[PDB]
Enzyme design. Structure first.
Site, PDB file in Angstrom:
ATOM      1  N   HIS A  61       0.776  -1.190   0.000  1.00 37.99           N
ATOM      2  CA  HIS A  61       0.000   0.000   0.000  1.00 37.99           C
ATOM      3  C   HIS A  61       0.836   1.282   0.000  1.00 37.99           C
ATOM      4  CE1 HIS A  61       0.034   0.952   4.520  1.00 37.99           C
ATOM      5  NE2 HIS A  61       0.011  -0.411   4.635  1.00 37.99           N
ATOM      6  N   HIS A  91       6.752   6.846   5.972  1.00 41.47           N
ATOM      7  CA  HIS A  91       6.117   6.519   4.709  1.00 41.47           C
ATOM      8  C   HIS A  91       5.463   7.764   4.166  1.00 41.47           C
ATOM      9  CE1 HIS A  91       2.918   6.033   7.662  1.00 41.47           C
ATOM     10  NE2 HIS A  91       2.153   6.568   6.749  1.00 41.47           N
ATOM     11  N   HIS A  93       1.981   9.206   1.622  1.00 43.64           N
ATOM     12  CA  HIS A  93       0.743   9.029   0.890  1.00 43.64           C
ATOM     13  C   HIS A  93       0.775  10.012  -0.255  1.00 43.64           C
ATOM     14  CE1 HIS A  93      -1.104   6.897   4.410  1.00 43.64           C
ATOM     15  NE2 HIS A  93      -0.235   7.618   5.058  1.00 43.64           N
ATOM     16  N   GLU A 103      -3.453  13.297   2.960  1.00 42.49           N
ATOM     17  CA  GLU A 103      -4.562  12.771   3.797  1.00 42.49           C
ATOM     18  C   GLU A 103      -5.178  13.922   4.551  1.00 42.49           C
ATOM     19  OE1 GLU A 103      -3.034   9.329   5.861  1.00 42.49           O
ATOM     20  OE2 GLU A 103      -4.260   8.123   4.462  1.00 42.49           O
ATOM     21  N   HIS A 116       4.673  10.857   6.681  1.00 41.95           N
ATOM     22  CA  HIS A 116       4.343  10.445   8.022  1.00 41.95           C
ATOM     23  C   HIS A 116       5.545   9.775   8.697  1.00 41.95           C
ATOM     24  CE1 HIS A 116      -0.135  10.293   6.975  1.00 41.95           C
ATOM     25  NE2 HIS A 116       0.332  11.527   7.156  1.00 41.95           N
ATOM     26  N   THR A 195      -4.654   5.473   9.465  1.00 39.86           N
ATOM     27  CA  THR A 195      -5.491   5.735   8.347  1.00 39.86           C
ATOM     28  C   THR A 195      -5.608   4.613   7.368  1.00 39.86           C
ATOM     29  OG1 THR A 195      -3.871   6.680   6.880  1.00 39.86           O
ATOM     30  CG2 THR A 195      -4.928   8.233   8.482  1.00 39.86           C
ATOM     31  N   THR A 196      -5.146   3.452   7.747  1.00 41.16           N
ATOM     32  CA  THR A 196      -5.399   2.191   7.054  1.00 41.16           C
ATOM     33  C   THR A 196      -5.924   1.246   8.071  1.00 41.16           C
ATOM     34  OG1 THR A 196      -3.183   1.135   7.414  1.00 41.16           O
ATOM     35  CG2 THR A 196      -3.529   2.446   5.445  1.00 41.16           C
TER      36      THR A 196
HETATM   37  O1  LIG Z   1      -1.763   5.355   9.144  1.00 38.95           O
HETATM   38  C1  LIG Z   1      -1.120   4.936   8.065  1.00 38.95           C
HETATM   39  O2  LIG Z   1      -0.433   5.454   7.168  1.00 38.95           O
HETATM   40  C2  LIG Z   1      -1.326   3.485   7.970  1.00 38.95           C
HETATM   41  C3  LIG Z   1      -0.453   2.680   8.887  1.00 38.95           C
HETATM   42  C4  LIG Z   1      -0.647   1.323   8.970  1.00 38.95           C
HETATM   43  C5  LIG Z   1       0.071   0.495   9.767  1.00 38.95           C
HETATM   44  C6  LIG Z   1       1.043   1.044  10.526  1.00 38.95           C
HETATM   45  C7  LIG Z   1       1.279   2.343  10.314  1.00 38.95           C
HETATM   46  N1  LIG Z   1       2.170   2.806  11.102  1.00 38.95           N
HETATM   47  O3  LIG Z   1       1.724   3.898  11.565  1.00 38.95           O
HETATM   48  O4  LIG Z   1       3.314   1.927  11.326  1.00 38.95           O
HETATM   49  C8  LIG Z   1       0.597   3.247   9.591  1.00 38.95           C
HETATM   50 NI    NI Z   2       0.272   7.393   7.072  1.00 42.23          NI
END
Ligand SMILES: O=C(O)Cc1cccc([N+](=O)[O-])c1
Ligand code: NI
Ligand code: NI
Length: 257
Positions: A61, A91, A93, A103, A116, A195-196
């Protein structure tokens, strides 16, 4: 088998995860005129000098840049936080087009992407335990706009061809996440969620006001990634953002006037 499509996207997630319709879901729209400046807020301390990046993974994802979180090497403290939060991964988005991808929104404005930086509260001992707590995580969110290149992003961009498909990883040592931060640490904060799926309500969000600039070419490279695994039909990894959710009974606080 969740995702971002018509048939398995955000609007379906509640069937598996009823918490999708909960009281503290993320992201939200940040109404800048209604966020209240908070003097209670202690200053934000980002301490990334000793960070140890390990690996980059396409998880189907997004891609995650993972850190050694076995010691206090890269920590977030202060702001709205009580105690010490250790960096585990970052990561992004992003969108199919420059006009969408973030987001969070700011007065309904969508940015091209959002970064994030995910941290867990050390009082809970590990990530898995922390996500079960209402104060388990702290996510630092940074908006990306398209303009000038971000030099500190290029190392990430150039390894993406090696992790094109779901499940691929590559060594990613010696990456300094300080090169992804804007000048100012002014922020908004509110209580929210992942958010997932599984959409856990465990996050203190800290969203920076100042975006970073990345080039068109940099973002293009994100959009070459694939949701699918190798040997499966190609589906470009784009539009991996959940839309804004209802604020409900929350207040967004500002660190600045
Ligand atoms: O919120 C998200 O981008 C999804 C998400 C999903 C699973 C773990 C995550 N993390 O914060 O390690 C983030
Ligand atoms: Ni995120
Ligand atoms: Ni599934």
């Amino acid at each position: 088998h969740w995702g971002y499509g018509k048939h398995n996207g955000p609007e379906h997630w509640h069937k598996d995860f009823p918490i999708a319709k909960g009281e503290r879901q993320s992201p939200v729209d940040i109404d800048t005129h209604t966020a209240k400046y908070d003097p209670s807020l202690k200053p934000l301390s980002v301490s990334y000098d000793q960070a140890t990046s390990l690996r980059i993974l396409n998880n189907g994802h997004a891609f995650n840049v993972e850190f050694d979180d076995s010691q206090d090497k890269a920590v977030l403290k202060g702001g709205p936080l009580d105690g010490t939060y250790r960096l585990i991964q970052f990561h992004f988005h992003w969108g199919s087009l420059d006009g969408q991808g973030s987001e969070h929104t700011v007065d309904k404005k969508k940015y091209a992407a959002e970064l994030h930086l995910v941290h867990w509260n050390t009082k809970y001992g590990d990530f898995g335990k922390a996500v079960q707590q209402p104060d388990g995580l702290a996510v630092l969110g940074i908006f990306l706009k398209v303009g000038s290149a971000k030099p500190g992003l290029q190392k990430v961009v150039d390894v993406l061809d090696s992790i094109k498909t779901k499940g691929k990883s590559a060594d990613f040592t010696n990456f300094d996440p300080r090169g992804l931060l804007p000048e100012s640490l002014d922020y908004w904060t509110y209580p929210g969620s992942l958010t997932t799926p599984p959409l856990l309500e465990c996050v203190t969000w800290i969203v920076l006001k100042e975006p970073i600039s990345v080039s068109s070419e940099q973002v293009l490279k994100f959009r070459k990634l694939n949701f699918n695994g190798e040997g499966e039909p190609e589906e470009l990894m784009v539009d991996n953002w959940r839309p804004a959710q209802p604020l409900k009974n929350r207040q967004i606080k500002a660190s600045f006037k």
